[PDB]
Amino acid sequence: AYGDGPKKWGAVLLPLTIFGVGITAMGTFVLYTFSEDFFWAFVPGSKRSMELEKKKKEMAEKYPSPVVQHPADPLAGLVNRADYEKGLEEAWDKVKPKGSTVTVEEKLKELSTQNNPHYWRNAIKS
Protein backbone atom coordinates (compact mmCIF):
# COMPACT_ATOMS: atom_id res chain seq x y z
CA ALA A 1 0.00 0.00 0.00
CA TYR A 2 0.95 3.67 -0.04
CA GLY A 3 1.61 3.73 3.70
CA ASP A 4 3.89 0.69 3.61
CA GLY A 5 7.44 1.51 2.68
CA PRO A 6 8.00 4.71 4.65
CA LYS A 7 6.27 3.02 7.59
CA LYS A 8 8.77 0.17 8.01
CA TRP A 9 11.81 2.15 6.88
CA GLY A 10 10.70 4.96 9.17
CA ALA A 11 10.19 2.69 12.16
CA VAL A 12 13.75 1.48 11.62
CA LEU A 13 15.50 4.75 10.76
CA LEU A 14 13.63 7.66 12.39
CA PRO A 15 14.33 6.29 15.90
CA LEU A 16 17.92 5.76 14.78
CA THR A 17 18.35 9.00 12.83
CA ILE A 18 16.85 11.20 15.53
CA PHE A 19 17.48 9.47 18.86
CA GLY A 20 20.70 7.57 18.23
CA VAL A 21 22.34 10.03 15.85
CA GLY A 22 21.45 13.19 17.78
CA ILE A 23 22.28 11.70 21.18
CA THR A 24 25.58 10.38 19.83
CA ALA A 25 26.32 13.80 18.34
CA MET A 26 25.59 15.50 21.67
CA GLY A 27 27.70 13.03 23.63
CA THR A 28 30.58 13.20 21.18
CA PHE A 29 30.44 17.00 21.28
CA VAL A 30 30.61 16.92 25.07
CA LEU A 31 33.60 14.57 24.75
CA TYR A 32 35.14 16.92 22.18
CA THR A 33 34.73 19.71 24.72
CA PHE A 34 36.92 17.73 27.12
CA SER A 35 39.18 16.57 24.29
CA GLU A 36 42.71 17.91 24.03
CA ASP A 37 42.02 19.23 20.50
CA PHE A 38 38.86 21.10 21.56
CA PHE A 39 38.71 23.97 19.05
CA TRP A 40 42.48 23.63 18.73
CA ALA A 41 42.67 25.92 15.70
CA PHE A 42 40.86 28.76 17.50
CA VAL A 43 42.41 28.48 20.98
CA PRO A 44 45.64 30.55 20.98
CA GLY A 45 48.74 28.59 21.89
CA SER A 46 47.05 25.20 21.66
CA LYS A 47 49.42 22.25 21.38
CA ARG A 48 48.20 21.10 17.97
CA SER A 49 48.27 24.64 16.57
CA MET A 50 51.75 25.34 17.95
CA GLU A 51 53.09 22.04 16.59
CA LEU A 52 51.53 22.87 13.22
CA GLU A 53 53.18 26.30 13.26
CA LYS A 54 56.54 24.74 14.14
CA LYS A 55 56.22 22.19 11.35
CA LYS A 56 55.22 24.93 8.89
CA LYS A 57 58.36 26.83 9.86
CA GLU A 58 60.46 23.68 9.45
CA MET A 59 59.01 22.99 6.00
CA ALA A 60 59.52 26.61 4.94
CA GLU A 61 63.16 26.55 6.06
CA LYS A 62 63.76 23.10 4.53
CA TYR A 63 61.92 23.51 1.19
CA PRO A 64 62.45 27.11 0.06
CA SER A 65 59.70 28.37 -2.22
CA PRO A 66 60.74 29.96 -5.54
CA VAL A 67 57.75 32.32 -5.39
CA VAL A 68 57.95 35.19 -2.93
CA GLN A 69 55.66 34.91 0.09
CA HIS A 70 54.16 37.49 2.40
CA PRO A 71 56.85 38.10 5.04
CA ALA A 72 55.81 37.16 8.56
CA ASP A 73 58.24 39.85 9.67
CA PRO A 74 57.59 42.84 7.37
CA LEU A 75 61.28 43.77 7.48
CA ALA A 76 62.26 40.22 6.48
CA GLY A 77 61.14 40.98 2.93
CA LEU A 78 64.22 43.11 2.28
CA VAL A 79 66.71 41.31 0.07
CA ASN A 80 69.59 43.15 1.80
CA ARG A 81 68.51 44.62 5.18
CA ALA A 82 72.14 45.66 5.62
CA ASP A 83 71.85 48.04 2.63
CA TYR A 84 68.51 49.33 4.00
CA GLU A 85 70.09 50.33 7.30
CA LYS A 86 73.28 51.68 5.62
CA GLY A 87 71.15 54.01 3.50
CA LEU A 88 69.09 55.06 6.52
CA GLU A 89 72.38 55.80 8.25
CA GLU A 90 73.59 57.93 5.34
CA ALA A 91 70.30 59.82 5.10
CA TRP A 92 70.13 60.37 8.86
CA ASP A 93 73.69 61.69 8.91
CA LYS A 94 72.68 64.01 6.08
CA VAL A 95 69.73 65.35 8.08
CA LYS A 96 71.02 64.86 11.62
CA PRO A 97 70.30 67.79 13.97
CA LYS A 98 73.77 69.36 14.44
CA GLY A 99 76.27 66.92 15.97
CA SER A 100 73.59 64.63 17.38
CA THR A 101 74.81 61.70 19.46
CA VAL A 102 71.93 59.46 18.36
CA THR A 103 72.79 56.76 15.82
CA VAL A 104 70.55 54.78 13.50
CA GLU A 105 71.25 51.28 14.83
CA GLU A 106 70.46 52.32 18.41
CA LYS A 107 67.18 53.86 17.25
CA LEU A 108 66.29 50.70 15.32
CA LYS A 109 67.04 48.60 18.40
CA GLU A 110 64.93 50.94 20.54
CA LEU A 111 61.98 50.82 18.14
CA SER A 112 62.22 47.06 17.61
CA THR A 113 62.43 46.26 21.32
CA GLN A 114 59.14 46.17 23.21
CA ASN A 115 58.10 45.12 26.71
CA ASN A 116 54.79 43.26 26.33
CA PRO A 117 55.15 40.19 28.56
CA HIS A 118 51.38 39.68 28.73
CA TYR A 119 51.05 39.18 24.98
CA TRP A 120 50.93 35.49 24.12
CA ARG A 121 53.96 34.06 22.31
CA ASN A 122 55.58 35.74 25.31
CA ALA A 123 53.52 34.07 28.06
CA ILE A 124 54.45 30.67 26.58
CA LYS A 125 58.06 31.47 27.54
CA SER A 126 58.79 32.24 23.89
Partner 1 sequence: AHAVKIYDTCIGCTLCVRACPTDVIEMVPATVNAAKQVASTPRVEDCVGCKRCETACPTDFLSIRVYLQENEETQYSLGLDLADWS
Partner 2 sequence: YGRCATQRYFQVLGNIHDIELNESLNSPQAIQALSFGQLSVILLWLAAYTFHIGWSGNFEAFIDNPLGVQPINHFVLDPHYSQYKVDTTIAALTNHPIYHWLMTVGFTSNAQIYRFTLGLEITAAVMLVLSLAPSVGLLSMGGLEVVSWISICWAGHLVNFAPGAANLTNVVMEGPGSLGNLMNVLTFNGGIQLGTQALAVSDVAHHHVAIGIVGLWISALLRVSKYAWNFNTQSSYHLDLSLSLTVGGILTSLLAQQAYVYPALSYLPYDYLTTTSLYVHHQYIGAFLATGGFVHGGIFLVRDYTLSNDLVGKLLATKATVISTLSWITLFLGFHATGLYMHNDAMAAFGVPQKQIIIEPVFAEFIQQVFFLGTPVYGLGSAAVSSTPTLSFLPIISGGDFLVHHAIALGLHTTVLVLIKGALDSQGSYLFPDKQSFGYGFACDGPGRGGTCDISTWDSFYLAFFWVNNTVAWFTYYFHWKVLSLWQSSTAVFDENSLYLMGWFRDYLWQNCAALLSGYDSLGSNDLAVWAWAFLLAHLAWATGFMFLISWRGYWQELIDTVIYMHLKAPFFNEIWSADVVTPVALSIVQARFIGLAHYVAGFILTYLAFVVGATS
Partner 3 sequence: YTESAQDAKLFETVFSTYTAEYLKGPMYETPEKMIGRRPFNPGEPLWGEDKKLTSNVLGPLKRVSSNELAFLTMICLAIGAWGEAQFLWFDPQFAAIDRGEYFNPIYIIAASLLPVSFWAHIACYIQKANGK
Which residue ranges make up the site for partner 2 (CB under 8 A)? 2-3, 5-7, 10-11, 14, 33-36, 38-39, 41-43, 49, 52-53
Exactly one of 1, 4, 9, 80 binds ligand CLA (CB under 6 A); that residue is 9
- Minimum gap (Å) between residue 56 Cβ and partner 3: 17
Closest CA to 44 of 118, 119, 120: 120
Q: Is 123 a residue that touches ligand CLA (CB under 6 A)?
A: no
Binding residue for partner 1, selected from 10, 44, 71, 77, defined by CB under 8 A? 44
Residue partners of 120: CB distance under 8 A and separation at least 6: 44, 45
Q: Rounded to an integer, what distance in angstroms lies between the CA atom of residue 48 and that of residue 54?
A: 10
Q: Which is nearer to partner 2, 12 or 91 (CB)?
A: 12
Least Cβ distance, residue 39 to ligand CLA (angstroms):
12
Q: Does 119 bind partner 1 (CB under 8 A)?
A: yes
- Give the DSSP letter string of 45-92: T-HHHHHHHHHHHHHHHHS--SS----SSGGGG-S-HHHHHHHHHHHH
